[PDB]
Amino acid sequence: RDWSSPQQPFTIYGNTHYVGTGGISAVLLSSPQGHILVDGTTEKGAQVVAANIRAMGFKLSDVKYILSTHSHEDHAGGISAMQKLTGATVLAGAANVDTLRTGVSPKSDPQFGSNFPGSAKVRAVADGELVKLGPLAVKAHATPGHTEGGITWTWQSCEQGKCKDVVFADSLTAVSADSYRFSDHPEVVASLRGSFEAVEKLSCDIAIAAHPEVNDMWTRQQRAAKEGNSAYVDNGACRAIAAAGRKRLETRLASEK
Numbered sequence: 211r212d213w214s215s216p217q218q219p220f221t222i223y224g225n226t227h228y229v230g231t232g233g234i235s236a237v238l239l240s241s242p243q244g245h246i247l248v249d250g251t252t253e254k255g256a257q258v259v260a261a262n263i264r265a266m267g268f269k270l271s272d273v274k275y276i277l278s279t280h281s282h283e284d285h286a287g288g289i290s291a292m293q294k295l296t297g298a299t300v301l302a303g304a305a306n307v308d309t310l311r312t313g314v315s316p317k318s319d320p321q322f323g324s325n326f327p328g329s330a331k332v333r334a335v336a337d338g339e340l341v342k343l344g345p346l347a348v349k350a351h352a353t354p355g356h357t358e359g360g361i362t363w364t365w366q367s368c369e370q371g372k373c374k375d376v377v378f379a380d381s382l383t384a385v386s387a388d389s390y391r392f393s394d395h396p397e398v399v400a401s402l403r404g405s406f407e408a409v410e411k412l413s414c415d416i417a418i419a420a421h422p423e424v425n426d427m428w429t430r431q432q433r434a435a436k437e438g439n440s441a442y443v444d445n446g447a448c449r450a451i452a453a454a455g456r457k458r459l460e461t462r463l464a465s466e467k
């Protein structure tokens with residue numbers, strides 16, 4: 211389950227489909243009017259995402275938007291290629307926009323110092339902004355800290371009349387380059403703290419974590435064969451991601467002293 215490894219795609223819930231790699235989440239939100247892709251995985255993983263969208267029975271030219279959680283190489287590395295294959299517009303938090311256009315992180319970024327291909331057609335979303343495509347409506351929530359422009363994305367998908375609130379959860383992890391210190395960046399720390407609070411408040415029936423194992427994707431999926439898509443449903447999921455971020459940050463800060 212490497213960041214770039216092939217992964218047979220699958221429906222998570224209604225029109226929410228997993229099209230990512232074995233190690234990085236990418237989600238296709240489909241409609242007869244066109245689709246929204248969330249994240250591009252790695253540069254190598256772009257080929258997997260492209261193959262996966264087609265294996266689900268969709269056309270790449272019908273993807274009108276690519277949404278970015280945060281601009282690290284493992285989630286955004288493949289966005290440039292996906293943008294080229296689709297002609298989509300790329301949407302990101304204001305502070306990660308330039309990282310996505312160029313491929314180079316800002317010095318503030320905990321993982322500043324690897325690069326990746328820059329993408330055309332990037333523009334910023336506002337916190338709370340609604341991204342619209344036909345019947346689709348995806349809301350941006352600023353969740354900074356792991357990066358400054360981190361966005362967690364929410365929508366609803368309905369399966370056989372049963373509608374659920376879906377959250378594509380950006381990373382809330384206090385991890386960085388080996389030389390970076392969260393102890394030296396109190397505003398980054400304060401951002402992460404705000405984000406835990408913001409995420410655990412989200413209406414959250416189905417959580418898809420940018421790192422899929424953060425909400426047990428592989429386990430839930432295996433169970434999905436037996437009990438159907440209710441296996442991905444767990445409304446404590448966003449609270450659990452936030453709690454794990456919180457505990458992880460306390461651990462990181464202590465270890466840095």
Ligand code: NA
Pocket residue numbers: 215216217218219258261262
């Ligand atoms: Na694949």
Ligand code: NA
Pocket residue numbers: 278279280281301302303306359360361
């Ligand atoms: Na973003």
Ligand SMILES: [Zn+2]
Pocket residue numbers: 280282356381
């Ligand atoms: Zn990251």
Ligand SMILES: [Zn+2]
Pocket residue numbers: 282284285381420421
């Ligand atoms: Zn990552």
